[PDB]
Amino acid sequence: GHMNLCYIDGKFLPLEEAKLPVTDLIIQRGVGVFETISTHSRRPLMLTPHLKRLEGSATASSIVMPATLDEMARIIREGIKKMGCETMVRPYITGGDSFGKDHLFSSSRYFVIFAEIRKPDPILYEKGVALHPINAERYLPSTKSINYMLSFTGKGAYEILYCPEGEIVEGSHSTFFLIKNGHLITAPTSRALSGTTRQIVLELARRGNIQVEERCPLLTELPEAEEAFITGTVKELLPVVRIGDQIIGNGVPGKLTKHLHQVYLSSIVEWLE
Amino acid sequence: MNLCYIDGKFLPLEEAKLPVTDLIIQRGVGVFETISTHSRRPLMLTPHLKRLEGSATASSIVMPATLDEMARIIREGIKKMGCETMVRPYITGGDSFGKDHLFSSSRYFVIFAEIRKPDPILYEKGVALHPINAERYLPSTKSINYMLSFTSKGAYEILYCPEGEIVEGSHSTFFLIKNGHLITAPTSRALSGTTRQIVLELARRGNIQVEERCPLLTELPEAEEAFITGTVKELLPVVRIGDQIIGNGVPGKLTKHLHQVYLSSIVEWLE
Ligand SMILES: *Cc1c(COP(=O)(O)O)cnc(C)c1O
Ligand SMILES: *Cc1c(COP(=O)(O)O)cnc(C)c1O
């Protein structure tokens, strides 16, 4: 393993030493966007797609990029080289100190945290997890912002599930997939964040001739479901056995979830950079 | 010279920093207040600090300092500024959400800045609001999350209008004047603004009828006047909401009257 690191103001620091000025509007106004990038075999997964989504997030938030993607990639690769071990990398783009008369954040800061990967406990893959449905949605759902406050305030659920007017969109942190009569159902990216894990799962489904519906699954359809799972770079495919007071299928991780997870882990090297 | 109280010291604001581990940075876990001065006395200090605790408590953040200590820090800071001051105390999540479902290592800092009232032209002409079909979740919490507020047509402020029901501004309480009545969203829906509270008490005193309901976007053609409220801006007239002019498109008689009564009455709530 290795010491957790933070790249900030041109230097790799011990994470515990990295500080941001209190003037930054990430602190005062929640103006921040970020990515989570994970390694397999010490290579970043979906590095260019994560970086393209980071720019996407900044641009949609009126934040000018403080560094080019080529620079971010060079910093991310140097940091993973310093860690010497499987790493979770989180680049952060801040608003910086001002919103100009031009309606842009033009003094954005950025920093990159490097940490050891802490996957969810293998028991949660064996037993599956519970989600808490709420009648709320993520606004600007293409933006991966730093605003997770609602995820904390919102029955021992692993994650809240945004279910506006009873349409399942996604988790606070994770893409949601439903399996009904061997089909994969997941919200369209008009409503859900364009997950990189979500994208890989959709391409594995295409390859394995599994039909995909890009529509919001309904809370009212959950009794008719066999399986469910949530996705994100660190968790991969995490089975979901319970949503509110509805058990999913027979209440244990299902056949198609475990299959797609195994295909994911066998296939993952194609998307490493 | 702007100051920031952090780790027991008043620093030049530019020198104050927070660790990047803090979940205010990583996860937007933070609450704050805006406290402003008249004649260098803090207005509604005790109500502001009560609402700060309310926001922290509702967000599962354990207060890192007592309200007596915050009040002491705020009063010393205003005294060091020696001008009319805007004060903003911030309570952060800190580095962890414990297995007890609490933020137990909260940090705090307090920013002191010279007060910047909106330009007197904006009081003379009034401002525009941009309506959005969105709402503030946990609307009684004054969180640091203003992402939506930034990101139309040089509108002063966005107006949360979920399903065409006007709730409030990103930063401000919204009041509509219709048939000489005052219309403002209930605190089931809108943040309990301190300025909002004082204006409702001035309406009671002046026998102006208040309806605590969400005014409808569809009612704005039938409205005479509107205004938004916040400690620094006081009552700021609103003459346009998207493409709808309010009344004759100028600050109205009742808005100006309530602003004058607000400025004459404000002594009673200074601390
Ligand atoms: C980051 C995130 C995800 C997961 O995306 P990955 O790229 O697969 O890691 C899902 N939903 C939300 C809301 C997220 O912010
Ligand atoms: C701070 C704030 C107000 C205004 O509150 P005052 O106590 O009058 O300054 C109104 N709406 C929201 C959303 C706010 O955050």
XYZ file of C-alpha atoms and ligand atoms in Angstrom:
574
model
C 0.000 0.000 0.000
C 0.911 3.746 0.238
C 0.231 7.106 1.928
C -2.893 8.947 0.663
C -1.836 11.911 -1.525
C -3.361 15.201 -2.756
C -2.053 17.070 -5.842
C -2.790 20.789 -5.221
C -0.862 23.968 -6.353
C 1.595 22.013 -8.512
C 2.778 19.531 -5.778
C 1.894 16.035 -4.485
C 1.249 16.508 -0.707
C 0.351 14.015 2.042
C -3.495 14.232 1.861
C -3.780 15.332 5.552
C -1.649 18.513 4.691
C -3.797 19.691 1.663
C -5.975 22.800 2.287
C -8.275 25.022 0.166
C -8.856 28.780 0.849
C -12.238 29.425 2.642
C -13.021 32.038 -0.132
C -13.562 29.175 -2.581
C -17.265 28.977 -3.630
C -17.057 25.120 -3.471
C -17.075 25.762 0.370
C -19.444 28.789 0.458
C -21.880 27.880 -2.429
C -21.358 24.090 -3.223
C -19.798 25.022 -6.647
C -17.702 21.910 -7.233
C -17.674 18.951 -9.625
C -15.530 15.788 -9.393
C -14.888 12.257 -10.713
C -14.086 8.901 -9.098
C -11.521 6.936 -11.176
C -10.398 3.429 -10.018
C -7.484 1.172 -11.069
C -7.273 -2.466 -12.058
C -3.673 -3.807 -12.482
C -2.507 -0.189 -11.560
C -4.128 1.333 -14.689
C -7.024 3.841 -14.582
C -10.392 2.470 -15.791
C -12.331 4.723 -18.240
C -9.806 7.546 -17.655
C -10.668 9.503 -20.873
C -14.482 9.080 -20.430
C -14.194 10.210 -16.698
C -12.074 13.224 -17.794
C -14.559 14.054 -20.603
C -17.435 13.813 -18.055
C -15.428 16.086 -15.625
C -15.129 18.772 -18.352
C -18.864 18.188 -19.114
C -19.745 18.805 -15.458
C -17.547 21.962 -15.182
C -18.927 23.396 -18.508
C -22.619 22.769 -17.567
C -21.852 24.504 -14.154
C -20.348 27.641 -15.881
C -16.883 26.672 -14.504
C -13.860 27.249 -16.834
C -11.390 24.296 -16.686
C -8.340 25.212 -14.484
C -6.153 22.665 -16.369
C -6.444 20.894 -19.729
C -7.564 17.206 -19.748
C -4.007 16.309 -20.992
C -2.648 17.957 -17.794
C -5.225 16.212 -15.533
C -4.323 12.824 -17.145
C -0.544 13.488 -16.669
C -1.219 14.395 -12.942
C -3.502 11.296 -12.475
C -0.893 8.941 -14.061
C 2.002 10.416 -11.933
C -0.095 10.071 -8.717
C -1.056 6.392 -9.487
C 2.728 5.780 -10.175
C 3.558 7.360 -6.687
C 0.912 5.135 -4.905
C 2.448 1.906 -6.386
C -0.861 0.114 -5.484
C -4.553 -0.106 -6.611
C -5.821 3.510 -6.286
C -9.107 5.439 -6.162
C -8.438 8.862 -7.798
C -10.798 11.826 -7.284
C -10.063 15.035 -9.253
C -12.075 18.049 -7.953
C -12.771 21.308 -9.864
C -13.869 24.202 -7.590
C -15.767 27.411 -8.473
C -12.835 29.389 -7.020
C -13.405 32.829 -5.473
C -15.873 34.599 -7.882
C -18.757 34.355 -10.331
C -17.813 37.125 -12.861
C -20.155 39.609 -14.663
C -19.611 37.201 -17.702
C -21.590 34.480 -15.663
C -18.400 32.244 -15.494
C -16.303 30.857 -12.623
C -12.917 31.978 -14.177
C -10.553 31.391 -11.143
C -11.463 27.693 -10.637
C -8.988 25.682 -8.521
C -8.405 21.941 -8.820
C -6.907 19.170 -6.675
C -6.575 15.394 -7.017
C -6.946 12.970 -4.066
C -5.292 9.544 -4.390
C -6.398 6.865 -1.869
C -6.305 3.027 -1.575
C -9.419 1.319 -3.076
C -11.879 0.227 -0.292
C -14.445 -2.002 -2.152
C -17.746 -2.691 -0.263
C -17.475 -5.756 2.126
C -17.843 -9.089 0.175
C -20.859 -9.925 2.523
C -22.808 -7.027 0.792
C -22.153 -8.850 -2.606
C -23.208 -12.237 -1.026
C -26.419 -10.874 0.692
C -27.161 -7.737 -1.436
C -28.233 -4.295 -0.097
C -31.419 -2.252 0.586
C -32.264 1.150 -1.024
C -34.505 3.898 0.531
C -36.840 5.393 -2.154
C -37.525 9.212 -1.902
C -39.931 11.378 -3.970
C -37.164 13.757 -5.173
C -34.886 14.094 -8.271
C -31.344 15.256 -9.068
C -31.547 18.504 -11.071
C -28.848 18.893 -13.790
C -28.487 15.116 -13.755
C -25.632 15.089 -16.371
C -23.466 17.075 -13.810
C -21.448 15.057 -11.220
C -21.496 17.823 -8.556
C -20.121 17.608 -4.966
C -23.688 18.110 -3.498
C -24.461 14.862 -1.583
C -26.080 16.589 1.498
C -29.537 14.906 0.855
C -27.797 11.429 0.739
C -26.902 11.918 4.514
C -30.117 13.464 6.028
C -32.551 11.196 3.981
C -34.318 1.602 7.898
C -30.509 1.023 7.424
C -30.657 1.558 3.590
C -27.247 1.355 1.750
C -28.230 4.312 -0.487
C -31.279 6.544 -1.184
C -32.975 5.977 -4.603
C -34.450 9.036 -6.386
C -38.010 7.919 -7.320
C -39.714 11.186 -8.445
C -43.536 10.546 -8.765
C -42.730 6.749 -8.403
C -40.295 6.624 -11.434
C -36.913 5.078 -10.340
C -34.095 7.223 -11.845
C -30.932 6.291 -9.875
C -29.172 6.311 -6.504
C -27.479 9.318 -4.839
C -24.131 7.681 -5.807
C -25.012 4.749 -8.135
C -26.789 3.836 -11.398
C -29.876 1.614 -10.747
C -30.600 -1.504 -12.975
C -33.752 -3.691 -12.727
C -33.972 -7.251 -14.185
C -37.539 -8.251 -15.264
C -38.124 -11.446 -17.455
C -34.349 -11.509 -18.290
C -34.439 -7.834 -19.591
C -32.194 -5.062 -18.154
C -34.179 -1.856 -17.287
C -32.377 1.433 -16.407
C -33.323 5.141 -16.584
C -32.212 7.070 -19.704
C -29.366 9.613 -19.368
C -31.985 12.363 -20.033
C -32.738 11.623 -16.275
C -29.768 9.631 -14.809
C -26.006 10.520 -14.770
C -24.093 8.928 -17.724
C -22.321 6.331 -15.536
C -19.071 4.839 -16.955
C -19.931 1.509 -15.157
C -23.510 1.915 -16.562
C -22.002 2.301 -20.105
C -19.764 -0.822 -19.746
C -22.764 -2.865 -18.397
C -24.935 -1.751 -21.396
C -22.125 -2.862 -23.835
C -21.738 -6.257 -22.002
C -25.592 -6.681 -22.249
C -25.463 -5.896 -26.072
C -22.620 -8.488 -26.467
C -24.499 -11.143 -24.343
C -27.765 -10.448 -26.395
C -29.566 -9.253 -23.167
C -32.392 -6.821 -24.130
C -31.998 -3.311 -22.565
C -34.893 -0.894 -21.987
C -33.632 2.674 -21.339
C -36.799 3.733 -19.398
C -37.334 4.565 -15.653
C -38.471 1.309 -13.895
C -41.624 1.975 -11.752
C -41.875 1.354 -7.961
C -45.177 -0.428 -8.935
C -43.172 -2.958 -11.146
C -40.863 -4.094 -8.308
C -43.163 -7.053 -7.238
C -42.810 -8.420 -10.850
C -38.925 -8.074 -10.759
C -36.392 -10.974 -10.392
C -33.296 -8.866 -9.593
C -31.805 -5.394 -9.221
C -28.308 -3.930 -8.756
C -26.506 -0.563 -8.543
C -23.247 0.409 -10.369
C -20.280 2.754 -9.824
C -16.516 2.502 -10.537
C -15.502 1.195 -7.038
C -18.560 -1.018 -6.268
C -18.772 -2.528 -9.837
C -22.244 -4.277 -9.765
C -23.708 -4.427 -6.220
C -26.911 -6.598 -5.903
C -30.041 -4.892 -4.470
C -32.432 -7.281 -2.650
C -34.864 -4.693 -1.080
C -36.285 -1.220 -2.023
C -38.398 0.354 0.748
C -40.549 -2.540 2.085
C -40.490 -4.432 -1.294
C -38.194 -7.506 -1.478
C -36.735 -7.932 -5.001
C -37.514 -11.469 -6.325
C -36.485 -14.200 -3.782
C -34.516 -11.611 -1.637
C -30.996 -12.913 -2.599
C -28.565 -11.761 -5.359
C -29.848 -13.168 -8.724
C -28.354 -15.232 -11.585
C -28.097 -12.415 -14.222
C -26.518 -9.870 -11.750
C -23.711 -12.401 -10.797
C -23.219 -13.313 -14.512
C -22.849 -9.594 -15.581
C -20.482 -8.994 -12.599
C -18.306 -11.983 -13.667
C -18.328 -10.793 -17.363
C -17.442 -7.255 -16.079
C -14.414 -8.521 -14.029
C -13.228 -10.796 -16.981
C -13.708 -7.948 -19.585
C -12.480 -4.897 -17.553
C -8.954 -4.648 -19.159
C -10.483 -3.449 -22.539
C -11.386 -0.040 -20.882
C -8.102 0.478 -18.857
C -5.778 3.258 -20.142
C -10.002 44.433 5.795
C -12.014 41.146 5.568
C -11.439 38.658 8.431
C -11.996 34.930 8.998
C -12.181 33.467 12.532
C -10.882 29.834 12.339
C -9.032 27.606 14.914
C -9.364 30.250 17.670
C -7.800 33.188 15.689
C -9.043 36.117 13.576
C -6.974 35.765 10.334
C -6.901 38.021 7.252
C -9.645 36.297 5.171
C -7.136 35.529 2.306
C -5.009 33.387 4.805
C -7.868 31.183 6.192
C -7.908 27.608 4.697
C -9.879 24.342 5.309
C -8.555 20.742 4.884
C -9.639 19.161 1.539
C -10.741 16.042 3.628
C -13.695 18.090 4.959
C -17.057 16.784 3.644
C -18.262 20.415 3.050
C -15.755 20.307 0.106
C -16.168 16.631 -0.913
C -19.944 16.179 -0.252
C -21.492 19.728 0.164
C -22.166 19.012 3.933
C -22.310 22.506 5.395
C -24.755 25.059 6.801
C -24.306 28.800 7.322
C -26.026 32.096 8.172
C -25.848 35.673 6.902
C -25.947 38.221 9.769
C -25.820 41.952 8.916
C -25.385 45.182 10.955
C -27.240 48.495 11.240
C -25.391 51.177 13.332
C -22.834 48.304 13.907
C -25.363 46.221 15.928
C -26.104 42.686 14.599
C -29.743 42.380 13.444
C -31.684 39.275 14.642
C -28.407 37.758 15.995
C -30.214 35.287 18.342
C -32.740 34.159 15.646
C -29.871 33.707 13.080
C -27.830 31.588 15.576
C -30.973 29.580 16.541
C -31.546 28.843 12.824
C -27.790 27.890 12.439
C -28.241 25.198 15.159
C -31.547 24.173 13.500
C -29.767 23.747 10.099
C -26.829 21.779 11.689
C -29.170 19.544 13.803
C -31.447 18.802 10.754
C -28.271 17.848 8.741
C -27.016 15.402 11.491
C -24.047 17.759 12.261
C -23.141 18.048 15.985
C -22.519 21.791 16.718
C -18.689 22.297 17.087
C -19.163 25.394 19.358
C -22.006 26.638 21.583
C -24.223 29.513 20.357
C -22.862 31.645 23.301
C -19.329 31.112 21.868
C -20.544 31.938 18.282
C -22.239 35.169 19.568
C -18.997 36.146 21.446
C -16.902 35.475 18.229
C -19.402 37.392 16.019
C -19.514 40.438 18.389
C -15.649 40.618 18.687
C -15.318 40.339 14.828
C -17.856 43.157 14.161
C -15.943 45.303 16.765
C -12.569 44.559 14.917
C -14.128 45.523 11.471
C -15.220 48.989 12.795
C -17.707 49.400 9.890
C -21.184 48.087 8.893
C -20.434 44.317 8.563
C -21.844 41.193 6.892
C -21.023 38.132 9.064
C -21.224 34.533 7.776
C -20.660 31.666 10.210
C -20.099 28.265 8.494
C -20.475 24.815 10.143
C -18.849 21.991 8.060
C -19.438 18.213 8.124
C -15.765 17.654 8.962
C -13.875 14.516 7.838
C -16.424 11.699 8.636
C -20.039 10.615 8.961
C -19.699 8.159 11.919
C -21.463 4.741 12.301
C -23.842 6.736 14.711
C -25.170 8.649 11.536
C -23.662 11.992 12.904
C -20.990 14.434 11.653
C -19.064 14.479 15.026
C -15.809 16.324 13.966
C -17.526 19.424 12.424
C -15.259 22.449 11.758
C -16.413 26.065 11.802
C -15.162 29.458 10.615
C -16.747 32.945 10.567
C -16.175 35.418 7.677
C -16.460 39.154 8.397
C -16.722 41.495 5.398
C -17.780 45.142 4.815
C -21.546 45.174 3.988
C -22.358 45.449 0.223
C -26.071 46.471 -0.130
C -27.465 46.111 -3.726
C -26.855 49.277 -5.892
C -29.544 51.978 -5.101
C -30.525 51.880 -8.869
C -31.839 48.250 -8.294
C -34.120 49.650 -5.447
C -35.260 52.533 -7.772
C -35.908 50.320 -10.889
C -36.488 46.865 -9.260
C -34.978 43.560 -10.499
C -35.949 40.521 -12.594
C -36.259 36.894 -11.325
C -35.703 33.754 -13.553
C -38.346 31.101 -12.693
C -37.176 27.397 -12.713
C -39.346 24.246 -12.312
C -37.265 22.969 -9.340
C -37.432 23.114 -5.492
C -35.025 23.311 -2.517
C -35.150 19.944 -0.690
C -35.014 20.288 3.138
C -36.134 23.882 2.651
C -35.988 24.725 6.435
C -32.123 24.005 6.300
C -29.867 26.956 5.209
C -27.231 24.752 3.477
C -24.180 25.945 1.467
C -25.697 24.273 -1.762
C -26.328 27.135 -4.309
C -25.146 25.259 -7.509
C -28.646 25.603 -9.132
C -28.649 29.412 -8.344
C -25.807 29.981 -10.964
C -26.302 27.530 -13.833
C -30.876 33.672 -16.950
C -31.265 36.777 -19.255
C -29.508 38.869 -16.505
C -32.238 37.913 -13.948
C -31.018 39.020 -10.433
C -31.860 35.579 -8.909
C -33.581 32.272 -9.790
C -37.106 31.745 -8.324
C -38.008 28.147 -7.385
C -41.462 27.617 -9.037
C -42.045 23.810 -8.710
C -45.088 22.822 -10.942
C -45.811 26.618 -11.362
C -46.137 27.216 -7.507
C -43.721 30.101 -6.518
C -41.859 29.094 -3.303
C -38.870 31.435 -2.927
C -35.602 32.695 -4.405
C -32.248 30.825 -4.369
C -31.152 33.444 -1.790
C -34.308 35.386 -0.838
C -37.943 35.077 0.388
C -40.480 36.013 -2.345
C -43.580 38.205 -1.561
C -46.405 38.924 -4.045
C -48.860 41.886 -3.646
C -52.316 41.020 -5.156
C -55.499 43.100 -4.366
C -53.363 44.899 -1.628
C -52.773 41.461 0.102
C -49.282 40.048 0.869
C -48.783 36.494 -0.528
C -45.726 34.381 0.524
C -45.040 30.616 0.556
C -45.588 28.907 4.015
C -42.525 27.666 6.005
C -43.651 24.080 5.173
C -42.185 25.061 1.690
C -39.912 28.158 2.156
C -36.985 28.805 4.591
C -38.083 30.801 7.726
C -36.346 34.017 6.657
C -35.597 36.499 9.496
C -36.479 39.388 7.086
C -39.666 37.414 6.102
C -40.593 37.175 9.843
C -40.115 40.958 10.445
C -42.107 41.854 7.246
C -45.037 39.542 8.317
C -45.018 41.357 11.778
C -45.017 44.797 10.022
C -48.007 43.604 7.852
C -49.873 42.473 11.076
C -49.136 45.936 12.674
C -50.284 47.821 9.470
C -53.501 45.611 9.115
C -52.221 44.356 5.684
C -53.799 40.872 5.093
C -51.229 38.039 4.645
C -51.993 34.728 2.898
C -49.282 32.118 3.622
C -49.742 30.163 0.332
C -47.472 29.686 -2.731
C -48.494 32.408 -5.278
C -49.039 30.838 -8.770
C -47.027 31.858 -11.891
C -50.528 32.080 -13.524
C -51.552 34.834 -10.949
C -48.625 37.189 -11.830
C -50.628 39.051 -14.618
C -53.263 39.863 -11.858
C -50.526 41.129 -9.381
C -49.696 44.830 -8.603
C -46.225 44.358 -6.965
C -43.590 41.892 -5.722
C -40.335 41.935 -3.707
C -37.667 39.598 -2.251
C -36.198 39.703 1.319
C -32.860 38.918 2.963
C -30.882 40.509 5.812
C -28.494 42.491 3.518
C -30.960 43.400 0.677
C -33.877 44.296 3.062
C -36.914 44.527 0.660
C -35.744 44.539 -3.008
C -38.622 45.269 -5.502
C -39.198 42.676 -8.282
C -40.679 44.181 -11.492
C -40.315 41.171 -13.881
C -40.467 37.362 -13.401
C -39.173 35.739 -16.605
C -41.247 37.368 -19.433
C -44.092 38.584 -17.086
C -43.946 42.293 -16.009
C -45.342 42.767 -12.454
C -47.990 45.546 -12.427
C -46.683 48.718 -14.229
C -42.985 47.408 -14.181
C -41.820 49.837 -11.400
C -41.422 49.521 -7.609
C -44.973 49.726 -6.121
C -46.544 51.836 -3.302
C -46.887 48.971 -0.729
C -43.286 47.656 -1.328
C -41.800 51.183 -0.677
C -44.079 51.723 2.394
C -43.018 48.328 3.997
C -39.315 49.102 3.242
C -39.613 52.502 5.015
C -41.466 50.879 8.011
C -38.733 48.129 8.028
C -35.886 50.762 8.210
C -37.794 52.759 10.981
C -38.723 49.561 12.964
C -35.396 47.683 12.721
C -34.057 49.033 16.150
C -36.339 46.609 18.047
C -34.507 43.496 16.579
C -30.852 44.812 16.842
C -28.737 43.021 19.516
C -20.721 9.060 -9.846
C -22.134 8.681 -9.893
C -22.575 7.442 -10.368
C -21.649 6.321 -10.814
O -20.891 6.589 -12.041
P -19.576 5.729 -12.461
O -18.938 6.511 -13.585
O -20.095 4.348 -12.929
O -18.657 5.638 -11.344
C -23.932 7.246 -10.425
N -24.854 8.158 -10.054
C -24.469 9.332 -9.569
C -25.518 10.324 -9.188
C -23.087 9.621 -9.477
O -22.724 10.818 -9.057
C -30.687 32.932 3.646
C -31.872 32.717 2.827
C -33.016 33.567 2.801
C -33.099 34.881 3.542
O -33.043 34.744 4.990
P -32.915 36.066 5.901
O -32.875 35.401 7.318
O -34.068 36.966 5.608
O -31.513 36.636 5.511
C -34.077 33.197 2.012
N -34.079 32.068 1.277
C -33.048 31.227 1.307
C -33.121 30.003 0.447
C -31.900 31.541 2.050
O -30.865 30.671 2.076
